[PDB]
Design an enzyme around this catalytic site. Structure first.
Site, PDB file in Angstrom:
ATOM      1  N   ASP A  35      36.020  46.734  32.597  1.00 48.43           N
ATOM      2  CA  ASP A  35      34.586  48.011  33.226  1.00 48.43           C
ATOM      3  C   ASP A  35      34.527  47.232  34.611  1.00 48.43           C
ATOM      4  O   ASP A  35      33.353  46.626  35.287  1.00 48.43           O
ATOM      5  CB  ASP A  35      34.181  47.698  32.031  1.00 48.43           C
ATOM      6  CG  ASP A  35      32.624  48.919  32.993  1.00 48.43           C
ATOM      7  OD1 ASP A  35      33.336  49.718  33.384  1.00 48.43           O
ATOM      8  OD2 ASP A  35      31.578  48.664  32.323  1.00 48.43           O
ATOM      9  N   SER A 199      34.283  58.428  50.126  1.00 54.35           N
ATOM     10  CA  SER A 199      35.669  58.560  50.384  1.00 54.35           C
ATOM     11  C   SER A 199      35.103  59.887  51.688  1.00 54.35           C
ATOM     12  O   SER A 199      33.666  59.802  51.995  1.00 54.35           O
ATOM     13  CB  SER A 199      35.538  59.680  48.854  1.00 54.35           C
ATOM     14  OG  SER A 199      36.580  60.549  49.743  1.00 54.35           O
TER      15      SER A 199
END
Length: 330
Positions: A35, A199
């Site tokens: 994770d 992004s």
């Protein structure tokens, strides 16, 4: 040194991925959920409340000659999906894919929430976010990666998750045969303890690319792709009959649909998520309403590039002095 381990979807939907991890002496192999959105290595154990264990493999520290109680240390964690676990702490030898750390904090669960109990395939979590998020008190502990880092050939690990198929976590090296083209690297902020990046935009299907900054985290421990409501609405508007259902808890779509792809930007590069990756199947057995793999982050407080996004790429988690993230197509 290096390590390399195969990671395997837990079910037919790729809801999560498990990777075998050796703990203790002799080795006890547990299948852990790696994770990159948390920083605790915790396991089901001989100390876990018996009624909360249902099929998981447990770590038994009393059977490990290298286990030592970390005296006074406790831990307690809550995840974004409302699940939780807590307990005490041992140090022990932990190996992943041939890479060994001695003295790793292994957080033994005394209690786990129902979601964990109900998932027989996940024996615990191995956190790979920054150690500043580790919950051990009163002495915070380091992640497996943080402990291994100085010994690694290169201070990196890579995630290569499969779509409905096994993939690979590598430590200490970049497998140049595992991706196509070049890797595009992008800046990371560690201010919130995550692999947080920005992004450069998105496209839906064959549509034009929208240049827009989307801050979010690269999180292998989250199943879906969670993005701003504007972006998510633009995606689902291209699917006939798709709608946001408050009763179901997100966007659903007719199972008869063919889903468009979704592209996200990494610098000037582009990662394309095929439409099929966005299908999470019937909302309940036999239903013709299917659950979407792109959902709104509104009310999470952060955008999450979870498995839906990451499995479309070869992803480099570069833990150099100034960390960065790399993405390549594959």
């Amino acid at each position: 040194s290096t390590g390399s381990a195969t990671t395997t979807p837990i079910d037919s939907l790729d809801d999560a991925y498990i990777t075998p991890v050796q703990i203790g002496t002799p080795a006890q192999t547990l299948n852990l959920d790696f994770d990159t959105g948390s920083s605790d290595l915790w396991v089901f154990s001989s100390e876990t409340t018996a009624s909360e264990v249902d099929g998981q493999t447990i770590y038994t520290p009393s059977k490990s000659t290298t286990a030592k109680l970390l005296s006074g240390a406790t831990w307690s964690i809550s995840y974004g999906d409302g699940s939780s676990s807590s307990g005490d702490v041992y140090t022990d030898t932990v190996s992943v894919g041939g890479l060994t750390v001695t003295g790793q904090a292994v957080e033994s669960a005394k209690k786990v929430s129902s979601s964990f109990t109900e998932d027989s395939t996940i024996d615990g979590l191995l956190g790979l976010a920054f150690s500043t998020l580790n919950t051990v008190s009163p002495t915070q502990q380091k992640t497996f990666f943080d402990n291994a880092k100085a010994s690694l050939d290169s201070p990196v690990f890579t995630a290569d998750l499969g779509y409905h198929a096994p993939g690979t976590y590598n430590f200490g090296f970049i497998d140049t045969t595992a991706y196509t083209g070049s890797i595009t690297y992008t800046a990371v902020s560690t201010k919130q303890g995550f692999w947080e990046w920005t992004s450069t935009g998105y496209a839906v299907g064959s549509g034009t690319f929208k240049s827009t900054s989307i801050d979010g985290i690269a999180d292998t421990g989250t199943t879906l792709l969670y993005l701003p409501a504007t972006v998510v609405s633009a995606y689902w508007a291209q699917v006939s009959g798709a709608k946001s259902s408050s009763s179901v808890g997100g966007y659903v779509f007719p199972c008869s649909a063919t889903l468009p792809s979704f592209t996200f930007g990494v610098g000037s590069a582009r990662i394309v998520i095929p439409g099929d990756y966005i299908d999470f199947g019937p909302i309940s057995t036999g239903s013709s309403s299917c659950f979407g793999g792109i959902q709104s982050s509104a009310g999470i407080g952060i955008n999450i590039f979870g498995d839906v996004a990451l499995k479309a790429a070869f992803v480099v988690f570069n833990g150099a002095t100034t960390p960065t993230l790399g993405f390549a197509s594959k």
